[PDB]
Design a protein around this ligand. Sequence first.
Ligand SMILES: OCc1ccc(-n2cnc3ccccc32)cc1
Length: 284
Amino acid sequence: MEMEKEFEQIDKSGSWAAIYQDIRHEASDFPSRVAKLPKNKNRNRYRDVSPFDHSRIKLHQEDNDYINASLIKMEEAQRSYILTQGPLPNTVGHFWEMVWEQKSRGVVMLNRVMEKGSLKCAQYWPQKEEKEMIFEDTNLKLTLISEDIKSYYTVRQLELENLTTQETREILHFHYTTWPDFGVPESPASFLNFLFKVRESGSLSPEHGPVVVHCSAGIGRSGTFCLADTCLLLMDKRKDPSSVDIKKVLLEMRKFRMGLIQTADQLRFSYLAVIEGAKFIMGD
Ligand SMILES: OCc1ccc(-n2cnc3ccccc32)cc1
C-alpha cells in the first residue's frame, strides 16, 4: 500500500502495536559473540543491545578492537551510517578513535547528557574553547572551535588532532536538544529541519566517511533518523515514489543492527516524518 493512506488505515484501526510486533518477529537474528566476551562488559551500556559480528566497527588496535557500533550500508539509497551507543566513561577515547579511523565528518547526537534524572551518556566533548580534552588511551586531542545554539538544536565546530602524527580535522557536532523525556515529538517539523541541516553540511555525503549517530542505546531515536533519511532519498531516486515501503526499509536496516525503532510510537513518528518530509522536498 501507499504510505499516507496505510497510515490513516492503521490510525483508524488502532493497530500500531500489532504492526510493530510483526516487524519484531520478522527481524534478523545474527551472532554478537565479540560483544558478549567477558573482557568487554564495561564497553556495553545495556546488556540487551549489542552489535552483530558481521557489521560491527573494528578499532585499529591489536589489544582490543571492540566498540558497541554498527555499519548500516544501504545499497539502493547509496548511503551509509554508523550507529553507536552514547559513550561511557571508559569508552570516550574509543569513540573519538572510531571517528578518526572511519574518516567521519559529522557526529549526530539525539539525547541530552541527563534525562529523567539519570546520566544517558558521558560529557564527551569540551564545553569551553580554552578547556580542551586529551584522551590519553588513544592519543587524541579535542578542542571546541565555535558553538551556535538554536531553539531546537545546537551545532558545534570541533578540532580533532591525532597527537601521534599531528594531523588535524574539523568535525561538526549536530545536537538535537528537544526530544521529550517520554514519548515522541507531537510534530515532526523540527526533527525534519534538523535532518536537513545535517544534509546541508556535507556530513552525509560520499566524499566523507559515514556519519556517526547516537542516542543512549543507539537504536531508537538513532533508528528514526536514518530510517527517515533513507526513505526520503529513495522517494527522490525512484520513478514511482509511492513504491517506497517503510516497513521493508526498516527490516533491511535491522540486518545490520538489532532493535532499530524501540516502540510503536517511534514507528508511527517515523511514518509521520517521511509523509510530511515528502511534501516539502517538492511543493505542497
Ligand atoms: O526526494 C523527496 C521526494 C521525492 C518524490 C516524492 N513523491 C512524488 N510523488 C510521490 C508520490 C507518492 C509518494 C511520494 C512521492 C516525495 C518526496
